[PDB]
C-alpha cells in the first residue's frame, strides 16, 4: 500500500516584551521653590548630587526576548 | 493497508511581559517650600544626595521573556 | 507502494520588544524657584551635580530580540 | 601656678587577615581513570560541567581591613 | 605662670591583609586518565565546561585595607 | 605669662595588601591523558570551554588601600 505524512504545525504566537515607562499621563507638573546654602564643606570621595530636578526617569538592561523552535521529521 | 498522518499542532498564545511604570495619571503633583542650610559638614567617603527632587524612576533589569518548542515526527 | 511526505510549517508570530519611553502624554510641565548658595567648598575626586533640570530620560542597554528556528527533513 | 599637659599615646598593634589556602602541603596528589559517555542529551537551560579536574580554587570577597582613630585634645 | 602643651601621638602599628593563595607546596601533582565520548548532545542557553584541568584559581574581590585617622589639638 | 604649645605627632605605621598567589611552590606538576571525542552536537548560545589544562590563574578586583589623616591645631 502506502505512507502519507502531512507535517503542517502552525505558529500564530507573541511574545511581547513592554518593559519601562508606558501611556502614563503627566497633567500640569509643577514645582515647589528649594533652596540650599551650603559652607566650609569639605569631600574626600565621589558626589554625585541632585537639587531641585522634576523629571522621569527609565532604565532598561533587561525587557529582552528569546524564541528558540525545532521542527523534526525523520523516516 | 495505509497508513496516514496528519500533524497540525497550532499555536495561538501570548507571552507579555509588562514591567516599569504603565497607565498612571499623575495630575497636578507639585511641592512644599524646602530649604537646607549646611556648615562645617566633612566627608571622608562616597556621597550621593537628593534634595527637593519631584520625580518618577523606573528600573527593569528583568522583564525579559523566553518561548521554546520543539516538534518531533519520527516514523 | 508509495510514500508521500508534505512538510509545510508556517511561522506567522511576532516577537516584539518595547523598552523605554513609550506613548506618554507631559501636559504643561513646568518648574518651581530653585536657588543655590555655595563657599569653601573643596575637591578631591569626581563631582557630578544636577540642578534645577526639567527632563525625560531613558537608557537601554537590554530590549534585544533573539530568534531561532531549525527546519530537518531526513528520510 | 602652671599647667603641663603631655600627650602620648603609643600604638604598636597588628591587624591582620589572612584569608584564603595558606601554608597547605599537597604531596603526590594524582588521579583515578574518569570516563564518560552521554548519548541523545538535550539541555534547555544554562549548563555549568566540570569532568575529572583535579584543582584548588580560593575565593575572597572578604578579608578587608578597617582601623579608624581619633585624637583630641581641647583645652 | 605659664601653660605648656607637649602633643607627641605616635602609630607604629601594622595593618595587613594576605588574601588568596600563599606560602603553599604542590609537590609532584600529577592526574588520571579521563576520557568523554559524547554524541547528538543539544544545547540551548549558556554552557561553561572545564575538562581534566589541574589547575589552582584564586579570585580577590577582598582584601582591602582602609585607614583614618584625627589628629585634633584645639587651645 | 605665656603659652608654649609643641605638635609631633609621628606615624611610622605600614598598610600592606598581598592579595593574590604569592610564595607558593610549584615541584614537578605533570598531567594524566585527556581525550575528547565529540559528534552530532549542536550549541545555540555561547560556550566557554577549558580541555586539559595545566595552569595557575589571579584575579584581583580588591586588594586597594586607602589612608585618611587629618592634623588639625587651631588657637
Chains 1, 2, 3, 4, 5, 6 share one sequence.
Do not use: A, M, W
Request: aromatic share 4%; charged share 25%.
Amino acid at each position: 500500500g502506502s505512507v502519507q505524512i502531512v507535517y503542517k504545525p502552525v505558529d500564530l504566537s507573541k511574545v511581547t516584551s513592554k518593559c519601562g515607562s508606558l501611556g502614563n499621563i503627566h497633567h500640569k507638573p509643577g514645582g515647589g521653590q528649594v533652596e540650599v546654602k551650603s559652607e566650609k564643606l569639605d569631600f574626600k570621595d565621589r558626589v554625585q548630587s541632585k537639587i531641585g530636578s522634576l523629571d522621569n526617569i527609565t532604565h532598561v538592561p533587561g525587557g529582552g526576548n528569546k524564541k528558540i523552535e525545532t521542527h523534526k521529521l525523520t523516516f
